[PDB]
Amino acid sequence: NAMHIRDMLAEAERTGEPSFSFQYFPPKTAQGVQNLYDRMERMYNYGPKFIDITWGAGGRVAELTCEMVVQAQAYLGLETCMHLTCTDMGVERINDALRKAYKAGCTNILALRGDPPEAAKDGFRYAKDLVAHIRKEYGDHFDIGVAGYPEGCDDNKDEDLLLDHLKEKVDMGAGFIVTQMFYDVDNFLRWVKKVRERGISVPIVPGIMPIATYASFLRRANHMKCKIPEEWMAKLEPVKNDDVAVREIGKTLVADMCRKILDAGIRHLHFYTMNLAQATRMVLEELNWLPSPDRPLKHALPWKQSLGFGRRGEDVRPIFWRNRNKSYVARTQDWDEFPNGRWGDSRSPAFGELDAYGVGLTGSNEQNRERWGEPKCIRDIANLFIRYMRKEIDYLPWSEAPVADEADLIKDELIDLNRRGLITVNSQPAVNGAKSNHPVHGWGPSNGYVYQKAYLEFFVSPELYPEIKRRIESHPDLTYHAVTKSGNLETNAQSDGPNAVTWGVFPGKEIFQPTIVERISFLAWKDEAYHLGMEWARCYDAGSPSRVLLEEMMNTWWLVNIVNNDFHQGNTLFEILKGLEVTDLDKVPETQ
Amino acid sequence: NAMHIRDMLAEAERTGEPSFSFQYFPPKTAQGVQNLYDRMERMYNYGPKFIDITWGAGGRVAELTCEMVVQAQAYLGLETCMHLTCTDMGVERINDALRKAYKAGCTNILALRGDPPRDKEKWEAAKDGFRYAKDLVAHIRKEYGDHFDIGVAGYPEGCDDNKDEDLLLDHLKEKVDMGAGFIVTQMFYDVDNFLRWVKKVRERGISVPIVPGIMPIATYASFLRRANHMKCKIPEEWMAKLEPVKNDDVAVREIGKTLVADMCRKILDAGIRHLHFYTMNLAQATRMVLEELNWLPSPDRPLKHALPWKQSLGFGRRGEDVRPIFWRNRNKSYVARTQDWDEFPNGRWGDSRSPAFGELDAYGVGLTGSNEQNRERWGEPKCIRDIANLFIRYMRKEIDYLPWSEAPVADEADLIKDELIDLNRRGLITVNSQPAVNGAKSNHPVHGWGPSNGYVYQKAYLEFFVSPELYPEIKRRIESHPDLTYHAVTKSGNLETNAQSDGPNAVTWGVFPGKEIFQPTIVERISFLAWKDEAYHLGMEWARCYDAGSPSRVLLEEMMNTWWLVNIVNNDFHQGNTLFEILKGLEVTDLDKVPETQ
Amino acid sequence: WKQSLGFGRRGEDVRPIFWRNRNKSYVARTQDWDEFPNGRWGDSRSPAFGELDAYGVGLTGSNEQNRERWGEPKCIRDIANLFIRYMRKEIDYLPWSEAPVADEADLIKDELIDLNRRGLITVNSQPAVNGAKSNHPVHGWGPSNGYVYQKAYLEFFVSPELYPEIKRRIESHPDLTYHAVTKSGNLETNAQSDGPNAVTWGVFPGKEIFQPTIVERISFLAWKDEAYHLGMEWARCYDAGSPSRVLLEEMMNTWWLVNIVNNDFHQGNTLFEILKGLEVTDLDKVPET
Amino acid sequence: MHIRDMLAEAERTGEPSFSFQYFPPKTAQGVQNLYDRMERMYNYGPKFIDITWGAGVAELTCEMVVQAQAYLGLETCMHLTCTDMGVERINDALRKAYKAGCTNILKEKWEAAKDGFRYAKDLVAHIRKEYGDHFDIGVADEDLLLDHLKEKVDMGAGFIVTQMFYDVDNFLRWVKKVRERGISVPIVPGIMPIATYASFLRRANHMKCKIPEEWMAKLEPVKNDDVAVREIGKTLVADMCRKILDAGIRHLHFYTMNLAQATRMVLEELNWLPSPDRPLKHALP
Ligand SMILES: Cc1cc2nc3c(=O)[nH]c(=O)nc-3n(C[C@H](O)[C@H](O)[C@H](O)COP(=O)(O)OP(=O)(O)OC[C@H]3O[C@@H](n4cnc5c(N)ncnc54)[C@H](O)[C@@H]3O)c2cc1C
Ligand SMILES: Cc1cc2nc3c(=O)[nH]c(=O)nc-3n(C[C@H](O)[C@H](O)[C@H](O)COP(=O)(O)OP(=O)(O)OC[C@H]3O[C@@H](n4cnc5c(N)ncnc54)[C@H](O)[C@@H]3O)c2cc1C
Ligand SMILES: Cc1cc2nc3c(=O)[nH]c(=O)nc-3n(C[C@H](O)[C@H](O)[C@H](O)COP(=O)(O)OP(=O)(O)OC[C@H]3O[C@@H](n4cnc5c(N)ncnc54)[C@H](O)[C@@H]3O)c2cc1C
């Protein structure tokens, strides 16, 4: 997708595909901020083209907004459009705001004059002045959008002069117009022609606000002075108290409005989420715009691609942060060059420090003990992993998210490894040329073919480790690396250099190879992997059976990764480990 | 592949595989030099690990040797070991010789004291030169560090002047201790003596790999003459077996095949795994022994290739592992054209890459041999059908050269042989192609390349000249298949294509253990535009073989000026033949038409 | 080495070479051991060395004093100089030695100086000995009328730029075994086993073979962390952001630590010879702040 | 030390790896002669030896294993059948071999001896269950046979030892057909060298071996002279061995028949016997 919203809107108008965006606002509680980041990350899977973040007048609002943009671009991987006003705004403040968004990796701004908390600190008078300011300062780095008013401005009710000012703001170098919320559709599509009539050619983006409650609906609508159709009123009237009935009615009311906007050729829909998923989600489902099995969400790469500052070109990573994306981003953030096309032999990557980068466990200890309980022996840990694999619990220390569907192939093999005490932290099955549109294995351009080498990574008792090493060396197709917290590194590798474990053949294109395995990267990963297990131990009280068990485990157990270079036969790897078991699975440590 | 001979010898001793080398010498005629370059290039296909080039006294000899090393490393793609003596050699002379070998891409030297000149009985050291070869080994080591792996001479039957076994092995210890990686021995015919000597070397704490000097038998005269000159012990059983057919050198060669090979078998049994053959600039004597050892490549043990094309070992081309498909059959040409490149492409071609590609004339990417000879090969075509015939003959191995190929018809072609023959008989004159491969084991006798226990893949490729009359219909048909991408071009300049970008399209790639994806062969626009000019130029140089105003000359010049050159990639590698099928039924008009001069 | 008389150590008679010059340290780290090694180290032995940060023994005296001793190094050549000064008995302490320069070093003094002046900063070593009388003033130890032997050992920091060339050279000698490691974690070696390699041993009359000094992987991994920590504690003597501080912290984070055993004890200096010609780049470079 | 590992390292290095099969003699004299012959053949340097198991003989076999492991210093593989064998007989046999220091095991009708086993697959599984992985276990209508071979192997056998053959082409074909069926374990060919013309033909015909007409034709003229037959059958058998070895199969198991010379001559013909030049290696003084 093109970084500039004007290009996205244009190709949306061309293909006719489902194209939509989500507007969010900065909450006051830092808690509400975390909830919003979680909600953002869930709504990500609906598949928006971009998101907006609104800009309030106050000082901490200005800072929070800038922090939120960074979060969204770098970690959540969401193309953001930061709003920016001239309300209480010195030019120093504006240049700061813009520099922050710049360094986030942002390429989209919405240029506003701004509602009051309108000349402030001798800033800019009109939004046209700020559009021209951005254009002069950053050239064509930021694509600029501007506000529009199909039902008139609240104070300003001369439609002809308004469209003249719109022409001004656009002519300063805006790429697109985003409108206020409306509920009179005929009025809107009329307005659109009147905009074009004035020689304003840019893409229009309607402001859609879906219905969540009868109260919030009517209150916000009346506050903005929206024309609500009597047919809408009459349909919502009988179940007005019941907001479940109102939400399932206003699903279809809003969606009908959207269908007529869409019919008219206007292809992008911008949803005012109000930091709420469900109201928007129900309308997107009503439009069958939400992804299905039948029309799944497309993935550029086998992993969640960042849109951070120097990360537009990043298209190769180690497998080891397959399940800790945000972490990899945090650790590699200070890289001046990201890897592209291949990892290469010369690359000596300097990964980030664990603590220094906030690469830790999620939530409170009290909560994590609630999730994971109090393990007294190795069998309890095994059980917990089996529960994760069966989707019964949703988080483990070594995974940002719940169990994959890619795992649901080899689910029972991994369960068997865990029940034997081979605690599996990471894996992928072998794939031998699945079509690039496979619902599970698919990634990258259409009409490709994707491939994977089988990978398996697990903790094992130092007693058992010798037997495992022996067995692995007795297989020619297997390569491993084994390491202890202590330092010791064993391997049967032929080289330092990276081994490709996921690759794709596409038409007209050089071979894509997004996932590798490599020694230095594994040494970076091992420290994280032991640290996570240690932070888990620190959830428990100092002398605990849980605490002593985990600390012991981490200090004394090996971490083994294994690649099966045979991608014709993948399960080879699970078979060669069958029958091995860790010695005293039920043993509780006495604390002496 | 190991660049240092010491490493090659070591891994040979480890795997146990067939490992052998060829020694050649600089000839006096520049003709003999050309013959030798041709012979070298043929013997290349036997698959040596390296070759040697000897170093005489004489100014011409010293320069020719250095030029021959460049040729061997850069163009013939043969890892060379240059000999270097202290005979008539100032230090300035030595530093020059070494710098030349350096810039060739050479990484192997044989450090010798050297036989005296043809003027001289006695060996006198040339002023500001070295006394012993130990001094030169240490010199190379000091100058170039560990860039050059150094080998030294050894004498299992004693030196010609020196018959004190004990002190000779002491000076061998000296030469080795100065930093030699391996020992190459003089020719011998007493094997028991050799394997005894080997233990006496090891006894003295000389651990380096030993490489026996094998000189196979070509004539009864040369055998006895060289052997007696060097004072070799020849077994009376060898003498007695060669005695009856001494005049008949055919019978002597088929006898001395098995005599020498039996000696080799006992050397090999003993654990010594590398054999260094003194070819005397002759293939057959060595070849017969290699066949006797079934060390020559077969279906059973096919020839290993690093990449789907002949890899250069030129200066700085060690890292070169991606090329356009278009010089699949003109390796030397691509080397010539790209020689002045600062960076060679590596791992991927990449999107921004804007390559230069040389100039045709001024680099010698032209016709091989005389016009008189090329007319002998190709005859005198009067119409387009005669050209078709010639291509079909090449495809059936009946003739060995066509303008657009350095070499005879490939085995990779022998899959799709009758498809290409059919295209030619219809007037679609095919210059270049490859079949589709969907994951053949990297040891495939036909498709195999690169490391062992890989899987290789290819997209089907087809490249041909077509009459401008027919071209429209071809274009139409190609566009009517979605998996096909093409580029079509005229000598005039005009370029048509259905490509979705400028960027390179991968057409050969390999998955190997412990390694990133190899992708050695691509297709790309700028490269194709470089190629088309060569391709038309070659057909025009063909025309220039004939007299001005010829039916042949006019025909070919016409053809080149007016015909399209079409390449086609089938992005489906599951089904390759789609592209041969799409073209079935089309034929060029006036195949038998002679262009009249009255 | 200096024998302990601690609680269960009267019978302790084998140690790794690595704490040859940090006795008190080894005692601190091994203090919680149930069984001290005796007669041989053995292959089964999995030694659990003590945690540095947990405390033990580190750098001696005040920072103010240590800066007085060692000065303020701005580049790698200044460090080289300081090591050469120690070797010539001019200064009495370096981070990696409890004491001043040994006499055993004063045999191979010029060889080690030459390594330091090339940027191969030598933290520990011993010369090869081929059957010196057990009463030798330098090499002697243990009972009278014995014969003592040593394999040559050499241990040094090297720039990661140069390390490749060193590895190449070492592998090109069959008698040499090495272990190389980074602060990062990475471990390279050409060893054929985990198990201990004997580097000092003695034949005595009426006695079994004495073998007090070994080299072994797990022990080396314990040692490397101490070795980098000592260089880091040295850096911490200087102010945060110092040229001295940045130099040393950089060095420790990015340089390799290589140990090498020459299993030929007939020819000892071969180890110092095979590293001739190597030199670290930018010896005089100051890291800019 | 487990034969499967030895066979694997042999297949890796490619070095000389070979074993000697002996049988229990009836006379205690023949036993002493055999112990002496074993001790001489020791110096040839086998990797292991086998001792066959008759109905009985059972007692003698167990005594012989102890002798071979403890005193002669020869790594032994004791054969064990289900012929006339209750489970108590089997457990006894196994306990004896255990205590020896051994770590390697291999009427009109065959009627399974009551409360014992029907098939060898049942005994492989029995050993595996009883003694875990202490003993490495070896095992002996082509389609159904290779199915049962898959069964015996899948019960936890580490290697296969074959019957004697004289058709080499057939063998190397068979090997691929075994691997075709997903039976990956190391194969060990049964080599029986020639000592007399009579014993050669008699045993070969009894086992129904295909003998090549070229072998027949070469031995025909000197059939009476067993000195000439032994120097011929040295090179006949050794040529067969060379082709097996070339094919990557690296261990050769010789049926000595309690006789040194027949085997010895073949080992010399292969220069697999030790020399001054390549002496027999000693672990300790
Ligand atoms: C999608 C969207 C998002 C919004 N987000 C925010 C937000 O994050 N924060 C916030 O505070 N507000 C926000 N608003 C509200 C908006 O910023 C205010 O309503 C704003 O003052 C309207 O002006 P404008 O931004 O359209 O720019 P302008 O059109 O430049 O505003 C100037 C006003 O003065 C009048 N005018 C008089 N003379 C002129 C002249 N010469 N040229 C131009 N106009 C003239 C116009 O009629 C107009 O009413 C948003 C509105 C929309 C539609
Ligand atoms: C494979 C091969 C290729 C060759 N190619 C060429 C070639 O291309 N051109 C060419 O000119 N020569 C070549 N030679 C060598 C040449 O023909 C002579 O044999 C050479 O003069 C002597 O061998 P060297 O170079 O190894 O001498 P060195 O070992 O350096 O010195 C030779 C002299 O040192 C003497 N010596 C022996 N022991 C001692 C001692 N302890 N102290 C001092 N001196 C001692 C020898 O007796 C002899 O007189 C080649 C040899 C081989 C084996
Ligand atoms: C290397 C070797 C060693 C020998 N060692 C001995 C020895 O120590 N003692 C001895 O007395 N003789 C031995 N012999 C000869 C022979 O084994 C015995 O005479 C006797 O016949 C024992 O069983 P078996 O030969 O049938 O073999 P086995 O292979 O043990 O036969 C049983 C196996 O064959 C298969 N099988 C056979 N019939 C069936 C069926 N109906 N249904 C299913 N599976 C079936 C099963 O897999 C079963 O496990 C040996 C022969 C060789 C080649």
Characterize the structure shown.
- This is part of a larger assembly, with 4 copies of chain A.
- In chain A, the strands form 3 sheets. In chain A, strands 1-2-3-4-5-6-7-8 form an 8-stranded parallel β-barrel, surrounded by 6 helices. Chain A has a 5-stranded mixed beta sheet with strand order 9-17-16-12-11.
- By secondary structure, chain A is α/β, with parallel strands linked by helices.
- Chain A has 19 helices and 18 strands.
- Chains in contact: A-B, A-C, B-C, B-D.
- The structure holds flavin-adenine dinucleotide (3 copies).
- One flavin-adenine dinucleotide (FAD) binds next to helix 5, helix 6 and strand 6 of chain D.
- Chain A: S-adenosyl-L-methionine 2 binds at residues 242-243, 339, 452.
Please tag this protein with its features:
part of a larger assembly, 4 chains, 592 residues, alpha/beta, five-stranded mixed sheet, 18 strands, elongated, binds flavin-adenine dinucleotide
Topology (SSEs and partners):
This is part of a larger assembly, with 4 copies of chain A.
Chain A: H1 5-15, E1 19-24, H2 30-43, E2 50-53, H3 59-75, E3 80-84, H4 91-104, E4 108-111, H5 127-138, E5 143-148, H6 159-171, E6 176-181, H7 185-197, E7 204-208, H8 214-224, H9 230-236, H10 243-263, E8 268-272, H11 278-286, E9 317-318, H12 325-332, H13 365-372, H14 378-389, H15 411-419, E10 423-428, E11 431-435, E12 449-452, E13 454-460, H16 465-473, E14 478-484, E15 489-491, E16 499-505, E17 512-517, H17 519-537, H18 545-556, E18 558-564, H19 572-576
Parallel strand pairs in A: 1-2, 1-8, 2-3, 3-4, 4-5, 5-6, 6-7, 7-8, 9-17
Antiparallel strand pairs in A: 10-13, 11-12, 12-16, 13-18, 14-15, 14-18, 16-17
Bound molecules: flavin-adenine dinucleotide (3 copies).
One flavin-adenine dinucleotide is lined by residues 54-55, 83, 85, 87, 112-115, 132-134, 152-153, 159, 161-162, 167-168, 170-171, 175, 184, 186, 213 of chain B.
Binding site for S-adenosyl-L-methionine 1 (chain C): 36-38
Protein name (chain C): Methylenetetrahydrofolate reductase-like protein
Binding site for S-adenosyl-L-methionine 3 (chain C): 38, 102, 104, 122, 125, 213
